[PDB]
Structure 1
Amino acid sequence: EVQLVESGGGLVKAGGSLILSCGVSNFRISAHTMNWVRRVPGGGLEWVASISTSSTYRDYADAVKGRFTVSRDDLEDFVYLQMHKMRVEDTAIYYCARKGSDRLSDNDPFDAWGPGTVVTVSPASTKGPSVFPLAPSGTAALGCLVKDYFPEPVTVSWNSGALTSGVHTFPAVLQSSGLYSLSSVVTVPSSSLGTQTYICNVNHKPSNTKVDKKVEPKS
């Protein structure tokens, strides 16, 4: 009635990081070598990592060395798997398995497995922003909305840097979709709405994206 259970799976962007934990029940992990294995969508199993007793030996599959790290916590019976610089082929169901038997020999099979946790790695590591105008409806206010980009940062100028007075670029917000959104506004004299042109320049270096958008008072 030995039991194991993983936690920490989920969705990750290409190049991101994700840490998985593994807890146990009705035995202690100190005496056992602990392993991480993954079932790829193709259906086959693939050995990921192994940590020996007292963390003397830490072994990784060739496809994950330099990117993955396995750790153990014997006093509280936990195992950890850090995955950095994640690739699309890292998408799999990750199980935490124990090496053991009725008597502990020097090389026993995987007699206990956890139910596994799903780890999905989306291919898109970056996304360019969509830029929409905030049209001026004395003093008028105008701007542009820079929405749905990943990751930070995004820089915004006005008229290639000519217009600096009265400009407010707000800090980015993290939307419930996982993409960032910000808005940049400027205060201008109303009379200048007909003559002076207003262009906001949005630069997103992670995607090498450059968008110049001008803003009108609409018809």
Structure 2
Amino acid sequence: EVQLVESGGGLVKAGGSLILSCGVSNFRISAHTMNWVRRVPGGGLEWVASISTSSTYRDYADAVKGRFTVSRDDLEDFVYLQMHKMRVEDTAIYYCARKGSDRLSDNDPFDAWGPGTVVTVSPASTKGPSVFPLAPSGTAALGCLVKDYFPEPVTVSWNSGALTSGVHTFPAVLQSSGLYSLSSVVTVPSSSLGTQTYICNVNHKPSNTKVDKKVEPK
């Protein structure tokens, strides 16, 4: 028996990027042309890429040609597949199989395969923010809490740029959900809380989302 061991596969977002790799055991890849194959949710096998012995010639299936790059390491026995700007239909199990035979030739089938690794390309390429008020309970503090937006960045202004003094817009934090969240605050005179209107202008160019939120006492 001989073995191949795919790694790196998981959840992805459309127009995002991932890299797969395949290790091996009981054999050396330095003799073999190495191939990537996938099984789509529709159940059919698609060939994806190959790279020759001696790393000479790299070839691709026409759905991934130009978008993907195949790579190899003949010494530690690893193969790689960069997947730049993935499509929703790049969702598949991705297998790494060796072109091979007991005696090798200038043309053979795939005589050993690894168990395959799942890749899912979720269709949400950009997510637009939610915006929530940070309500002011001398000097008072108020703000806006931008949340659940992808990718960065978000820009925030206050009163269309007329209110700049005392404003702090914080660096975003990356949540364990894979989505970003930032807060923008401003300190102002407590006396102005009844008359002055405070509006934070949240712009998210990647989703083409604009939100104007008025922040007022509860």
TM-score range, shorter chain: over 0.9
Give the match's secondary structure for 2:54.
Answer: helix
Deviation of 1:92 (Å): 0.1
> Using the alignment, how far apart are the partners of 1:190 and 1:145 within structure 2?
21
Please give the TM-score of this superposition, normalised by the length of structure 1. 0.99
Q: How many residues of Structure 1 are paired with residues of Structure 2 in the alignment?
A: 218
Q: Is it true that 1:209 corresponds to 2:197 in the alignment?
A: no
1:88-136 superposed Cα distances (whole Å, 9 cap, x missing partner): 0000000000011110011111000000000000111001000000000
> Using the alignment, how far apart are the partners of 1:181 and 1:132 within structure 2?
11
1:125-153 superposed Cα distances (whole Å, 9 cap, x missing partner): 00100000000000000000000000000
Deviation of 1:178 (Å): 0.4
Measured on the aligned residues, the alpha-carbon RMSD in Å equals: 0.4
> Using the alignment, how far apart are the partners of 1:54 and 1:153 within structure 2?
43
1:75-97 superposed Cα distances (whole Å, 9 cap, x missing partner): 00000000001000000000000
Deviation of 1:67 (Å): 0.6
Deviation of 1:72 (Å): 0.6
1:133-177 superposed Cα distances (whole Å, 9 cap, x missing partner): 000000000000000000000000000000000000000000000
> Using the alignment, how far apart are the partners of 1:199 and 1:185 within structure 2?
11
Deviation of 1:65 (Å): 1.0
Deviation of 1:66 (Å): 1.1
Deviation of 1:209 (Å): 0.5
Deviation of 1:24 (Å): 0.2
Give the match's secondary structure for 1:38.
Answer: strand
> Using the alignment, how far apart are the partners of 2:19 and 2:125 within structure 1?
18
1:171-203 superposed Cα distances (whole Å, 9 cap, x missing partner): 000000000000000000000000000000000
Give the match's secondary structure for 2:5.
Answer: strand
Give the match's secondary structure for 1:30.
Answer: helix
1:175 is aligned to 175
Deviation of 1:216 (Å): 0.8
> Using the alignment, how far apart are the partners of 1:81 and 1:23 within structure 2?
12
> Using the alignment, how far apart are the partners of 1:103 and 1:47 within structure 2?
23
Report the identity percentage: 100
